[PDB]
Amino acid sequence: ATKLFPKFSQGLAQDPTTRRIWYGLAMAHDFESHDGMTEENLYQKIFASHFGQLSIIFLWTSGNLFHVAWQGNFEQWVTDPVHIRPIAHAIWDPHFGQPAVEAFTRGGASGPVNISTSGVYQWWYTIGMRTNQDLYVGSVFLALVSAIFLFAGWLHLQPNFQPSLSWFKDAESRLNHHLSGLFGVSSLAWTGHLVHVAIPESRGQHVGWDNFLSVLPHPQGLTPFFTGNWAAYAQSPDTASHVFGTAQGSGQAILTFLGGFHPQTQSLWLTDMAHHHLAIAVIFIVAGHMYRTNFGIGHRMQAILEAHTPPSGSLGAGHKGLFDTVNNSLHFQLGLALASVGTITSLVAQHMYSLPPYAFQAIDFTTQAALYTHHQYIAGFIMCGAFAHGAIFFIRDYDPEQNKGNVLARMLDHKEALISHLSWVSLFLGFHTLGLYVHNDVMQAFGTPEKQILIEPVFAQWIQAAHGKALYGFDFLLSSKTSAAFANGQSLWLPGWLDAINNNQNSLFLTIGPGDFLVHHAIALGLHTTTLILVKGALDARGSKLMPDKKDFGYSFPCDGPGRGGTCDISAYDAFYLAVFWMLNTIGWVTFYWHWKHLTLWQGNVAQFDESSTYLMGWLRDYLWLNSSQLINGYNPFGMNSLSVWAWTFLFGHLIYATGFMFLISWRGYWQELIETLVWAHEKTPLANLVYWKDKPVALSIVQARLVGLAHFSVGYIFTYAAFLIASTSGRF
Amino acid sequence: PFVPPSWAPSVFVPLTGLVLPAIAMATLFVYIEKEAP
Amino acid sequence: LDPQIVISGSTAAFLAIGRFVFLGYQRREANFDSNSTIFATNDPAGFNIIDVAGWGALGHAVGFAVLAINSLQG
Amino acid sequence: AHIVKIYDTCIGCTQCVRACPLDVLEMVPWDGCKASQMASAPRTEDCVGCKRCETACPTDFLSVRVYLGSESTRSMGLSY
Amino acid sequence: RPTWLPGLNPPAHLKGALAGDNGFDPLGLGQDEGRLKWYAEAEKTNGRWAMMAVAGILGQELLGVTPAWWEAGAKEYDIPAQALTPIEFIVMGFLEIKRYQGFKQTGTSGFINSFPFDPAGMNSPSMATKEVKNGRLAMVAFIGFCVQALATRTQPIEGLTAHLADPFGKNITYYLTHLPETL
Amino acid sequence: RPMWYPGATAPAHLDGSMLGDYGFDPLRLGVNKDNLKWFREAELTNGRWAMAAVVGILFTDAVGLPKFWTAGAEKYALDNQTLALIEVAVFAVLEGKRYEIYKKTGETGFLSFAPFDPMGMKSEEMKLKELKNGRLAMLAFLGFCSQAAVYGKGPIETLQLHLADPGHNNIYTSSVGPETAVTVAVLCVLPMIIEATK
């Protein structure tokens, strides 16, 4: 009979097989495919889901704060943040034997704990947290915020509180409020916290809710701000002998732009960060008054889009009708948001390792490596999702009649040229990068290392020289002492920036050579190939020569059968599917390069990387084989240490990856026949045929098989690299 | 203070690991196989 | 540098260029830009309270930027 | 159940009906072609979705299309 | 009917039927009559609470209490603040739920089950306008009390006397500029 | 017909046919008619057990006998291993006879006696009094365990300590103060939440 689950799909509820549960779980968030769904109901469900997501995020943050305040060593880590390892949380496992108990008992705790690698200790220490009471109060506050967000999500679904469809389409009002309030006012408030709490707490002065109304952030007290003498806030900054957390060497300035890093914490100045947030707050608030909402002044995005067509007709109709195809399509907005968020996540990773913002973050090698790898993998997944949603937009929301002659239609008009050129770039990069690598490998194998091709990256070195690095000797722009660009910043920020960039002990514009050139080309190959697969799948989503009516089958369908030569993996979903492997490979190459260069930097031997990164054998032996010795020795027949959990996780990831290869290689048919034999065996077995199944056992579908195999592949990939990176970086240092 | 007792992990870890998942799995299993009227 | 003189002069200058110079251009661009409240005013040129706030905001930003640069002593 | 559709480009060659392994299609009289016949799908409740009919269609593009829809005991080809 | 801005016509959603209707709604928060009447009740009760708060602050200062109005929370009292919060929440929940349910039956204020709570008569539309205007003045006065205590650290009557003693000085300019001297 | 707050509404399945109805079912677990009877019987037996347990705990503190949470550790004139075997052996037959009573009649019973009332005061008003007293005793037992968890000592001792300083000795000034205060505020806001949406 018809089952209750899933309530959103009547066709799935009538399915008498096990496929009903799987499809009900995988199509729960596809509100557009639900039964009796309207546009207004769609937007309302997304609103409630957004509130629930915020509730989960805030609860997770409160949980991290609570566990650090309860089972951590934050009160002891602030005293000696160079020789004390941060504690994530305690370990309570009845499966642990005695050696595992004393092995994980470290960091000054009274029992087995986990050493945190997220870097929340440095972040909380920099923003002003000093005691466990502060973390406890922050945890309770975030839990209350999470409960409020959850209640808001439940409340916006009840009658008299459901927003209308017209409210969700007010793009001008939403953009104005997000730029001025969500971005500008939030940044201004963060500036207020840095000026009022973080900066005085870094100078040994406690400023909490009990005394912030009686403690002045500056000795002049708002007089220079109102009189326009803003330069008075940059007078007397922290000297080079300032000790973080104490008043020794501290200054009085609150808004500076010294640049560079703090001599002790090796991080950005707090006054510089406060000034940064103040400037971007003013800029975002000003930008929040651009669109017309209810007072006559402002813009209409439709007018700006319609008045942006070239006169010669190079772009056809230009952007006519682009306002309606974006405002009425949620997949277009989701794709744009994911593309920007993925790029910003990558930007965060690069800027965070190169310019550490939190105190004593550069010394924590495990934290730096884990944070960079985490943000780069998150960025790669988000980028793949952006392109997948672009393909979904082409299939479900693109209207050729409304987008007639504009840039959107012209993209599909010459999609063959785009795919062909992406293919050519990827082919050239792959052929040459692989050829140079194999050539260097043959030269190193034959005992002639002077015969390998080592192309110097003169363009990137030229840019590094433009930033102030005098190692290469170009002597121009910031590298030349007689340039206008150099002389115009010598009194504001160039001294600190130049001192930091010319220091070879940090990660600020590291020295590069032929190995960096080759790996950068490998990165370019990965980016271009992943882009080729994603772009080709989005452009061919509506159809191709093999499947002229692909848009009539949806975004995800198994195939079109073995006819016409065979149509396996013809849908756009399959294109995203194949692109996830390339994304994992690209992020693997970038994280491998980052980890090896930083490992050789921290070990004090950059020549090892410079001489072994030019051939793949050096990558396999000097980086993968050499750095995994301590990892695989976490547990051996002679005993175990605290690093055994990473060894177990290493083997765990290998097992999950290999398990994924099963769903990836073997296909449905074999499993369906095997399941039929199992059905017969259960039906003909006494004492067991009395227990019957409620859902008919069937093999996983083709699409489900691909998703399951990719999920196992990605999980094994991530867990294996995370275990190796954390174990190698923590054991070495 | 918000500090939990010393015996809090010995009670919450077995709860969240065996009691709560068993109840959740049983309730979810009954809900999935429930037949519509 | 007198802050009051600089702020007052910048605000008055921006209000003057917004009422006697760029008012026609802004009105032509606002009408071609195609619930609301009509902020009708007795000003013969149609310069309402919203325009006053916008031009005063621009003048204040310019005046404070000038005061800030002069305060930097460079 | 799956959705099987016949289009006007059908030439009435009866190749799709002969290739159907569950007797879903048939031939009905028509006047839009030389063969004076047209394919039809009056028993789509028994269609499994093997797409053999699409493989047997000679028109460009195909005159018969199978869109995988809801799954049941008959559409999944389950003998248990 | 005079409006807030000269030469500005009042909006269509705002009619003189309400008590303090002066055609002031640049943001248009009272488009529908449902939200308009709910906001009217919200304004009346906000003004009532502000009237009682301003009267209490002025009475506390006039009677010479030891702590200022912004320190009364931390003052020692029998049945500490940790225990006063649940009692207040329970009684306020009962009183407010009775007030809200009485508002659904009839669009007027009340007290538990007296809707309208009007003993001894003396009710008229003019009195309603006076109530709304006094509530608005009290709300603005309470915000003035808060900002005055923040920037000057002086109580309302004390700050008023300080301003009367020296008018050309001891104002917002002096207090905003001589901020370190105040602390 | 009073409800669980001034102005509630029955959730379309608590019209009032059952005794002690107040329209309290936010989780809607009694939506099924068959589950409503079983849940009612479970509530009645839980209430009876809580009634006897609360009376027993209150009587032990007056005489001076060991505390209810430490009476098990005391050594009695028997073996705990034999006590558990006898307890499950007797209760197997007792619960089996009680379950068969509910299938034939629908209420509780003792052994082979379904309407167990040797005196005979089984009235409609008496059935509702049993439910009200059982609910009160269930809350009382939860209070006994909670008071012994944070304060220890005992129920009678807890009441005696509360009279010494009621404004300073309460759940809000104890170790679970902020949690229960936030919960009380959330609960006080709850009827307005339900009335605002309806």
Swiss-Prot record, chain A:
One of its GO terms (cellular component) is chloroplast thylakoid membrane. Its EC number is 1.97.1.12. Keywords: 4Fe-4S, Chlorophyll, Chloroplast, Chromophore, Electron transport, Iron, Iron-sulfur, Magnesium, Membrane, Metal-binding, Oxidoreductase, Photosynthesis, Photosystem I, Plastid, Thylakoid, Transmembrane, Transmembrane helix, Transport. It is found in: Plastid, Chloroplast thylakoid membrane. GO terms for molecular function: 4 iron, 4 sulfur cluster binding; chlorophyll binding; electron transfer activity; magnesium ion binding; oxidoreductase activity. InterPro entries: PSI_PsaA/B (IPR001280), PSI_PsaA/B_CS (IPR020586), PSI_PsaA/B_sf (IPR036408), PSI_PsaB (IPR006244). Changing residue 654 to C/G/N/S: Contains somewhat decreased amounts of PSI, depending on the strain; significantly changes the spin density of the P700+ cation radical. It catalyses: reduced [plastocyanin] + hnu + oxidized [2Fe-2S]-[ferredoxin] = oxidized [plastocyanin] + reduced [2Fe-2S]-[ferredoxin]. It holds the Pfam family PsaA_PsaB. It is a multi-pass membrane protein. The chain crosses the membrane at residues 46-69, 135-158, 175-199, 273-291, 330-353, 369-395, 417-439, 517-535, 575-596, 643-665, 707-727. Belongs to the PsaA/PsaB family. This is Photosystem I P700 chlorophyll a apoprotein A2.
Curated annotation (Swiss-Prot), chain C:
It comes from the Eukaryota. The chain crosses the membrane at residues 5-25, 49-69. GO terms for cellular component: chloroplast thylakoid membrane; photosystem I. It is a multi-pass membrane protein. The keyword Signal does not apply. It is found in: Plastid, Chloroplast thylakoid membrane. The keyword GTP-binding does not apply. Keywords: Chloroplast, Membrane, Photosynthesis, Photosystem I, Plastid, Thylakoid, Transit peptide, Transmembrane, Transmembrane helix. Not yet known. This is Photosystem I reaction center subunit V, chloroplastic. It comes from Chlamydomonas reinhardtii. The chain holds residues 32 to 122 of 126 of the full protein.
From Swiss-Prot, chain D:
GO terms for molecular function: 4 iron, 4 sulfur cluster binding; electron transfer activity; metal ion binding; oxidoreductase activity. PROSITE patterns: 4FE4S_FER_1 (PS00198), 4FE4S_FER_2 (PS51379). It catalyses: reduced [plastocyanin] + hnu + oxidized [2Fe-2S]-[ferredoxin] = oxidized [plastocyanin] + reduced [2Fe-2S]-[ferredoxin]. InterPro entries: 4Fe4S_Fe-S-bd, 4Fe4S_Fe_S_CS, PSI_iron-sulfur_center, PSI_PsaC. [4Fe-4S] cluster 1 binds at residues 10, 13, 16, 57. It holds the Pfam family Fer4_7. Residues 1-30, 38-67 form the 4Fe-4S ferredoxin-type domain. Gene3D superfamilies: 3.30.70.20. The keyword Calcium does not apply. Keywords: 4Fe-4S, Chloroplast, Electron transport, Iron, Iron-sulfur, Membrane, Metal-binding, Oxidoreductase, Photosynthesis, Photosystem I, Plastid, Repeat, Thylakoid, Transport. Binds 2 [4Fe-4S] clusters. Cluster 2 is most probably the spectroscopically characterized electron acceptor FA and cluster 1 is most probably FB. Changing residue 34 to D/E: Drastically decreases affinity of PSI for ferredoxin, limits photoautotrophic growth at medium and greater light. Decreases cross-linking of ferredoxin to PSI-D and PSI-E. It comes from the Eukaryota. The keyword Acyltransferase does not apply. GO terms for biological process: photosynthesis; photosynthetic electron transport in photosystem I. Its cofactor is [4Fe-4S] cluster. Coiled coil: none annotated. It is an enzyme of class 1 (oxidoreductase). HAMAP family: PSI_PsaC. The eukaryotic PSI reaction center is composed of at least 11 subunits. Apoprotein for the two 4Fe-4S centers FA and FB of photosystem I (PSI); essential for photochemical activity. FB is the terminal electron acceptor of PSI, donating electrons to ferredoxin. The C-terminus interacts with PsaA/B/D and helps assemble the protein into the PSI complex. Required for binding of PsaD and PsaE to PSI. PSI is a plastocyanin/cytochrome c6-ferredoxin oxidoreductase, converting photonic excitation into a charge separation, which transfers an electron from the donor P700 chlorophyll pair to the spectroscopically characterized acceptors A0, A1, FX, FA and FB in turn. The gene is psaC.
